[PDB]
Amino acid sequence: ENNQSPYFTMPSYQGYILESAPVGATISESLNLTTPLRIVALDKDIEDTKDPELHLFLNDYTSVFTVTPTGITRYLTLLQPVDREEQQTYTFLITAFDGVQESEPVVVNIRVMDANDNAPVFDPYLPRNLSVVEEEANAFVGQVRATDPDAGINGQVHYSLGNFNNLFRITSNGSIYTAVKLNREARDHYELVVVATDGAVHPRHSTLTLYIKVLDIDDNLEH
Ligand SMILES: [Ca+2]
Ligand SMILES: [Ca+2]
Ligand SMILES: [Ca+2]
Ligand SMILES: [Ca+2]
Ligand SMILES: [Ca+2]
Ligand code: NA
Numbered sequence: 001e002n003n004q005s006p007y008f009t010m011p012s013y014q015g016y017i018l019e020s021a022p023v024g025a026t027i028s029e030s031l032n033l034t035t036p037l038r039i040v041a042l043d044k045d046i047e048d049t050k051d052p053e054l055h056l057f058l059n060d061y062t063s064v065f066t067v068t069p070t071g072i073t074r075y076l077t078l079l080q081p082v083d084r085e086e087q088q089t090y091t092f093l094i095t096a097f098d099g100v101q102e103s104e105p106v107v108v109n110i111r112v113m114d115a116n117d118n119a120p121v122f123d124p125y126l127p128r129n130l131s132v133v134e135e136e137a138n139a140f141v142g143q144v145r146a147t148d149p150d151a152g153i154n155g156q157v158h159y160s161l162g163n164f165n166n167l168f169r170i171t172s173n174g175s176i177y178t179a180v181k182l183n184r185e186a187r188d189h190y191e192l193v194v195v196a197t198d199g200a201v202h203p204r205h206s207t208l209t210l211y212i213k214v215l216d217i218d219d220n221l222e223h
Contacts, residue, residue, distance in 0.1 A: 001045070002045050002098055002099065002100045002101075003045065003100075004043060004044040004045045005043075005098070005101045005102070005103055005104075006041055006042065006043040006052060006054050006096040006097070006098045006101075006102075006103045007041065007042060007043070007096070007103045007104065008039065008040065008041050008094070008096065008103060008104075008106045009040040009041070009042060010040075010106070011106065012106055012107045012108070012109075013037060013039060013094070013106060013107070013108040013109070014029075014037075014108075014109050014110075014111075015027040015028065015029065015037045015076060015108065015109070015110040015111070016028045016029070016030060016031050016033055016110065016111050016113055017033070017078065017082065017110060017111075017112055017113065018033055018112075018113045018114075018115055019081075019082050019083055019084040019112050019113065019114065019115050019117065020115035020117055021078060021082075022078075023078050023079065023080060023081060024077060024078060025077065025078045026075050026076065026077055027065070027075070027076040027077070027078070027110060031111070031113065033113065036075050037075065037076055038073050038074075038075065039056070039067065039073070039074045039075070039076065039094065040072060040073050040074070041054050041056060041072075041074065041096040041103065042072075043096075043098050045098065049072075051070065051071060051072050052072070052098065053070075054096045054097065054098055055096070055097045055098075055099075056074055056094055056095070056096050056097075057094070057095055057097070058092050058093070058094055058108075059092055059093040059094075059095070059105065060092040060093075061090055061092050063079055063080060064078070064079050064080055064082065064090065065077070065078065065079060065090070065092075065110070066079055067094065076108075076110075082112050083112075084112045084113070084114045084115070084150075084151065085118070085149045085150070087112070088111065088112050089109065089110070089111060089112070090108075090109070090110040090112075091107065091108070091109050091110075092107075092108055093105035093106065093107060093108070094106055094108055114150055114151035114152070114154055115150075115154075116150055116154040116198065116200035116201075116202055116203075116204055117150065118148055118149050118150045118154075118155075118198075118204065119148070119196075119198070119204040119205060119206045120146035120147065120148040120157045120196035120197070120198055120204070120205070120206045121146055121147060121148070121206060122144060122145070122146045122194075122196065122206060122208045123144070123145040123146065123147070126142075126143055126144055126145060127142065128208065128209070128210050128211060129210075129211045129213075130142035130176075130210055130211065130212045130213070131212070131213045131214075131215050132178060132182065132212060132213075132214060132215065133182075133214075133215045133217065134181070134182045134183055134184040134185075134214050134215060134216065134217055135181045135182065135183065135217055135222060136178060136181060136182075137178055137179065137180050137181050138177055138178060139177060139178045139182075140175065140176075140177055141168065141176040141177060141178060141192075141210075141212060142175075142176050142210060142212070143174055143175055143176070144159070144170075144174040144176070144194050144196075144208060144210070145174045146159075146174070146196035146206060148196075148198050148204075150198065150200070152199075153198070153199035153200055153201075154198055154199065154200045155198065155199075156198060156199040157196050157197070157198060157199075158172070158196070158197045158198070158199065159171070159172065159174055159194065159195065159196055159197075160194075160195045160197065161192065161193060161194060161195065162192075162193025162194065162195050162207055163191075163192065163193045164190055164192055166179060166180070167179055167180055167182070167190065168190075168192060170194065176192070176194070176210070182214050183214075184214040184215070184216050184217075185219070187214065188213065188214045189211075189212065189213055189214065190210075190212040190214070191209055191210070191211060191212070192209070192210040192212055193207055193208075193209055193210075194207060194208045194209075194210060195207050196208075
């Protein structure tokens with residue numbers, strides 16, 4: 001009949017999932033997101049090689065993760081999209097039940113791996129209408145800043161220019177300077193494309209357009 005408590009074959013479980021993973025995805029056993037986490041529950045009332053027909057259940061995160069419902073070997077699958085930028089680690093217990101007695105609970109930890117799922121976002125408060133005086137190389141034009149909430153290289157931001165790359169320079173902290181002496185009598189305005197690109201292997205970028213006005217030096221004072 002049913003006098004032996006079911007039990008898991010390992011003392012704990014560590015899982016890994018990429019945040020971009022679709023609902024339905026199986027949780028992996030290692031950080032390389034290859035082979036699955038296998039959760040095996042046995043019960044000595046049942047001859048080996050036979051499915052002990054156990055009920056496995058989680059103590060928390062029951063809207064986020066579920067266990068496959070049959071089999072000697074069970075897997076964990078995603079119920080809803082996860083987000084590393086909101087929560088990176090899940091910890092909960094799983095328990096097996098044979099209809100009469102429970103197993104000891106086992107601790108499961110899952111790490112959500114980062115996807116490069118965010119582009120840099122420009123700070124919307126830094127001015128986009130800028131001025132600079134003509135006839136001065138290395139003159140400060142303006143400041144931009146972008147931040148990227150992804151992890152490590154996926155969240156590191158690099159700046160470049162999308163146009164006028166012989167006229168302006170941008171620094172690694174978002175400061176724009178003239179490369180050369182501007183000349184208002186040649187052109188009094190520049191619509192400068194600034195690019196913020198992350199450090200990902202598969203990079204993402206964003207752009208901003210800056211409205212630069214060239215200020216006059218009275219022509220009587222230009223040498
Ligand atoms: Ca049993
Ligand atoms: Ca990113
Ligand atoms: Ca991310
Ligand atoms: Ca001039
Ligand atoms: Ca002038
Ligand atoms: Na995310």
